[PDB]
Design a protein around this ligand. Structure first.
Ligand SMILES: Nc1nc2c(ncn2[C@@H]2O[C@H](COP(=O)(O)OP(=O)(O)OP(O)(O)=S)[C@@H](O)[C@H]2O)c(=O)[nH]1
Ligand SMILES: [Mg+2]
Length: 173
């Protein structure tokens, strides 16, 4: 039971926040990438566990740039946006609003990277602030280490949140 409906998700964020690493994580390295563009396939079971279950082959696109470098020719037919910020760089979170303007009804997900580089002391403060940040985009938030494959393991809280986001992208479209 495989769906042929297109689902295109853009991965946006400042240079170096972890976008390519995140695409590799979320797609289990089913990724084709080069200096210009990176696309991954994230296989997603929509409404899993019901007679309505269908498998979707979601595209995750990472084309880089900066909010001067514009890649708008890659922003066509987008159904959802993952906004990526580096939890050790507060400036990368301030730029998510501008990134979102490069492309309302399009669902958004906010993902913070490099959680492993935040000490248990300063962690509570960063996470309170990222909850507020996600609220600004009417979005759920996931904070993780992109280099740890357990970060989005099947059945984890993070995976449930990502799955909820993909379900919404499919429904809105
Ligand atoms: N410790 C740690 N390192 C990370 C994490 N995510 C990314 N990195 C590291 O940060 C560096 C940048 O990550 P990368 O995935 O290349 O960013 P990018 O957003 O794709 O960078 P770009 O210039 O091509 S646009 C890499 O060395 C990568 O290994 C993370 O969650 N934890
Ligand atoms: Mg990249």
């Amino acid at each position: 039971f495989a769906s042929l409906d297109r689902v295109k998700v853009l991965v946006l964020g400042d240079s170096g926040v972890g976008k390519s690493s995140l695409v590799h994580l979320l797609c289990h390295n089913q990724v084709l990438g080069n200096p210009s563009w990176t696309v991954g396939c994230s296989v997603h079971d929509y409404k899993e566990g019901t007679p309505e279950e269908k498998t979707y082959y979601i595209e995750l696109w990472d084309v880089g740039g900066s909010v001067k470098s514009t890649r708008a020719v890659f922003y066509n037919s987008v159904n959802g946006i993952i906004l990526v910020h580096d939890l050790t760089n507060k400036k990368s979170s301030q730029n998510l609003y501008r990134w979102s303007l490069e492309v309302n009804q399009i669902p958004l997900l906010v993902i913070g990277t490099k959680l492993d580089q935040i000490h248990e002391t300063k962690r509570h403060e960063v996470l309170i602030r990222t909850a507020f940040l996600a609220e600004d985009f009417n979005a759920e938030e996931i904070n993780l280490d992109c280099t740890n494959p357990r970060s989005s393991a099947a059945g984890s809280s993070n995976a449930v949140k990502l799955s909820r986001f993909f379900d919404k992208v499919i429904e809105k479209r």
